């Protein structure tokens with residue numbers, strides 16, 4: 001954390017300033033009441049909103065003038081890494097768990113490959129929401145998690 | 151000889167064969183056992199003279 | 211049974227090809243394949259393009275043998291024909307190669323004796339270290 | 352047509368799936384752009 | 393020349409003998425399978441090493457193996 | 473008595489060099505003939521590199537499994 005918060009970084013302010021002037025420059029050729037003008041003014045308003053949020057959410061900045069992320073585990077920045085991540089692992093786990101629920105449903109059947117190239121959508125729709133409680137995979141792990149043959 | 155317009159009447163129209171991947175080839179219409187099946191399906195898709203040996207069918 | 215012998219028999223009609231024999235035939239070896247044709251027919255030459263079979267006995271000289279079997283195999287199917295091929299050498303000695311035992315190799319014959327067969331099949335062979343320094347090789351066993 | 356349903360759910364199932372995903376992702380961004388962090392906690 | 397071996401795992405299908413481009417293998421009487429025949433490599437001097445034989449064996453593991461060895465004119469497939 | 477594993481029985485391969493090595497498969501038949509090195513033909517649900525689903529094995533090359 002050898003950095004300075006973005007709220008109080010001159011370089012971070014110079015970037016917002018320089019960016020807006022560039023978009024405003026383009027604003028000149030199109031005159032006022034105009035489609036491009038409204039499009040550029042919308043980018044400018046989207047630009048201000050962006051920088052505003054970064055400062056607002058206490059993100060440090062580097063001498064470069066750009067925010068940098070802390071992933072150490074520090075509590076002030078869970079938003080930077082840890083919070084989104086857990087969110088990921090939830091979804092990743094969801095997808096994988098549902099995907100594995102399908103293969104087991106498919107495995108003891110006729111031609112199993114037939115449903116791997118042509119999806120059983122009724123079956124899939126039945127199993128998709130099981131991923132919602134996928135971290136109760138843990139309780140499968142206490143018993144039938146993985147194969148004993150290997 | 152005399153040149154003229156020659157045609158034949160309806161020769162089938164159904165979604166039945168859409169539901170059956172690799173129908174055009176007798177080897178590959180049985181379905182996949184390995185992932186090689188999938189690649190072969192796209193590589194022999196336009197090989198018409200590999201599908202049948204009748205010149206009339208290939209031409210059509 | 212004794213193999214057939216030859217040779218003074220005519221050869222097929224061809225125009226000339228670049229795939230023909232070379233110095234190897236002159237100083238190392240060359241091969242001859244012979245067959246009996248029922249009709250005067252046209253066939254694809256392994257070395258070249260197209261040649262005409264001559265009705266009756268036929269004689270063809272090819273380099274390498276594989277060329278001999280490739281043509282011969284084609285002769286067996288396609289048209290039904292009986293063929294044989296020999297290895298010439300340069301001195302003049304000749305050597306009967308195929309079939310070599312009456313019958314073709316696909317068909318089991320009682321005269322034949324096995325060569326290079328390991329009765330402990332499988333990949334039950336020993337590790338290379340075991341034969342290390344012993345001229346042997348694991349498969350040879 | 353059973354069969355038509357059958358053409359579907361092939362790798363057309365992938366594109367229908369990913370097109371839906373792309374749409375959802377795009378709308379989210381249109382709604383919440385330039386997000387470098389999760390700021391709700 | 394190359395080295396070619398056969399194993400009692402052979403079932404006498406005879407496919408390799410049919411596959412070989414240079415007449416290396418042949419079948420001989422045996423009593424280890426229902427076909428009562430087994431492959432043999434009596435002419436490994438004419439082999440080229442293309443492994444068409446191996447490519448045609450249905451045993452779980454090949455019952456005919458080709459160990460590429462010392463190179464000769466015959467094995468190098470040279471017409472010159 | 474009859475020679476090998478029952479017909480319905482599923483077995484575990486012990487070939488090592490077999491594709492379906494530490495896996496299982498069901499026996500189809502057993503050649504009743506002595507002198508036959510490898511009887512006990514077996515078939516597998518999944519195909520090997522050579523696209524074949526069946527192979528013969530020695531008696532000591534299979535373990536009955538339940």
Ligand code: CLA
Nearest residue numbers: 099103115116117121124185188361362364365367368371
């Ligand atoms: C290299 C060659 C190769 C090839 C060609 C394949 C090919 C395939 N693999 Mg294999 N795989 C490979 C190597 C390969 N794999 C290797 C090396 C491994 C590691 C050992 C694996 C491990 C593996 C696993 C574990 C799985 C596969 C699966 C698959 C199949 C997925 C098909 C698919 O995505 O449809 C589409 C998939 C979707 C999820 C689309 C979503 C469909 C939803 C659920 C229903 C439809 C909703 C609808 C469309 C949306 C509505 C919106 C609309 C109204 C707008 C496909 C046949 C999967 C399979 O078998 O399929 C079931 C499977 O689970 N592979």
Ligand code: CLA
Nearest residue numbers: 117118168170171172173188361362365366369370371373
């Ligand atoms: C126009 C003719 C046509 C074309 C272009 C294709 C093309 C394809 N086929 Mg299909 N096929 C066809 C006819 C065709 N097929 C017919 C008539 C049949 C039945 C006989 C089949 C049966 C068939 C099977 C069984 C399979 C294919 C598969 C495939 C895919 C190969 C795997 C791959 O791309 O990797 C990666 C796959 C993807 C990237 C999925 C996404 C594909 C869509 C088109 C992109 C989505 C766009 C996205 C929303 C925006 C861009 C996002 C960006 C980040 C990429 C490829 C997309 C394989 C497959 O798709 O595996 C899942 C497969 O298993 N085909």
Ligand code: CLA
Nearest residue numbers: 174188189190191192193194195196197198199200201208
């Ligand atoms: C008049 C134009 C024409 C026509 C009608 C054909 C027709 C045919 N060709 Mg020929 N070919 C052509 C031009 C043509 N070719 C040219 C210009 C070349 C030089 C490259 C070739 C080289 C060629 C080879 C080497 C082969 C053929 C073969 C074939 C036959 C089967 C091919 C097939 O199934 O399609 C299948 C189609 C695909 C699998 C699509 C693959 C996608 C390509 C490879 C990449 C496309 C990328 C795209 C351009 C941009 C990227 C987008 C991406 C990110 C989504 C078929 C008779 C095959 C044959 O055996 O003949 C009997 C064969 O092996 N062609």
Ligand SMILES: CCCCCCCCCCCCCCCCCC(=O)OC[C@H](CO[C@@H]1O[C@H](CO)[C@H](O)[C@H](O)[C@H]1O)OC(=O)CCCCCCCCCCCCCCCCC
Nearest residue numbers: 053080084368371372375379383384385386387388389390
């Ligand atoms: C397939 C189709 C069908 C499936 C769909 C079914 C599911 C339907 C669910 C849809 C519901 C939508 C939920 C809406 C959620 C709100 C979205 C939102 O909040 O906007 C995104 C929001 C932020 O949004 C912000 O909100 C602010 C609040 O007022 C303002 O609105 C700002 O405009 C906006 O930007 O939060 C985020 O999650 C973005 C955080 C990004 C996290 C990135 C950090 C990771 C980068 C670093 C980590 C590196 C990792 C690499 C590791 C390897 C390193 C070696």
Ligand SMILES: CC1=C(/C=C/C(C)=C/C=C/C(C)=C/C=C/C=C(C)/C=C/C=C(C)/C=C/C2=C(C)CCCC2(C)C)C(C)(C)CCC1
Nearest residue numbers: 083084085086087088089090091092095096376386387388
């Ligand atoms: C946006 C966002 C998010 C999300 C996330 C997610 C949800 C995801 C995902 C994703 C996914 C789900 C993915 C994927 C992918 C995959 C891939 C990309 C692959 C592949 C492949 C490959 C490439 C392979 C290859 C191979 C093979 C196959 C075999 C062997 C060899 C090799 C390796 C070659 C979050 C919130 C978190 C954060 C922020 C925002």
Ligand SMILES: CC1=C(/C=C/C(C)=C/C=C/C(C)=C/C=C/C=C(C)/C=C/C=C(C)/C=C/C2=C(C)CCCC2(C)C)C(C)(C)CCC1
Nearest residue numbers: 369370371372373374375376377378379380381384385386
């Ligand atoms: C028409 C036609 C044609 C063509 C067409 C074309 C050319 C096309 C295209 C197309 C395309 C080319 C497309 C596309 C698309 C894309 C998309 C739709 C996207 C996306 C995505 C996303 C959603 C993203 C995501 C993300 C983010 C942002 C965050 C994190 C990371 C990631 C990356 C994941 C032709 C001529 C052939 C002919 C026929 C007809």
Ligand SMILES: CC1=C(/C=C/C(C)=C/C=C/C(C)=C\C=C\C=C(C)\C=C\C=C(C)\C=C\C2=C(C)CCCC2(C)C)C(C)(C)CCC1
Nearest residue numbers: 071072073081082092093094095096097098100134137146
């Ligand atoms: C804390 C933290 C950190 C560090 C960390 C670490 C270092 C850790 C770790 C880690 C580890 C060391 C881990 C491990 C593991 C393991 C294992 C062993 C696994 C497994 C698994 C499984 C079995 C799964 C399965 C599944 C599921 C569950 C879901 C989906 C489907 C599937 C199947 C995929 C950092 C500083 C970066 C950041 C802050 C926070």
Ligand code: SF4
Nearest residue numbers: 402403405406408449
């Ligand atoms: S091909 Fe394989 S199995 Fe068939 S005979 Fe020759 S060796 Fe025995």
Ligand code: SF4
Nearest residue numbers: 412439440442443445
């Ligand atoms: S390798 Fe080619 S040449 Fe040598 S034996 Fe097997 S098939 Fe005949």
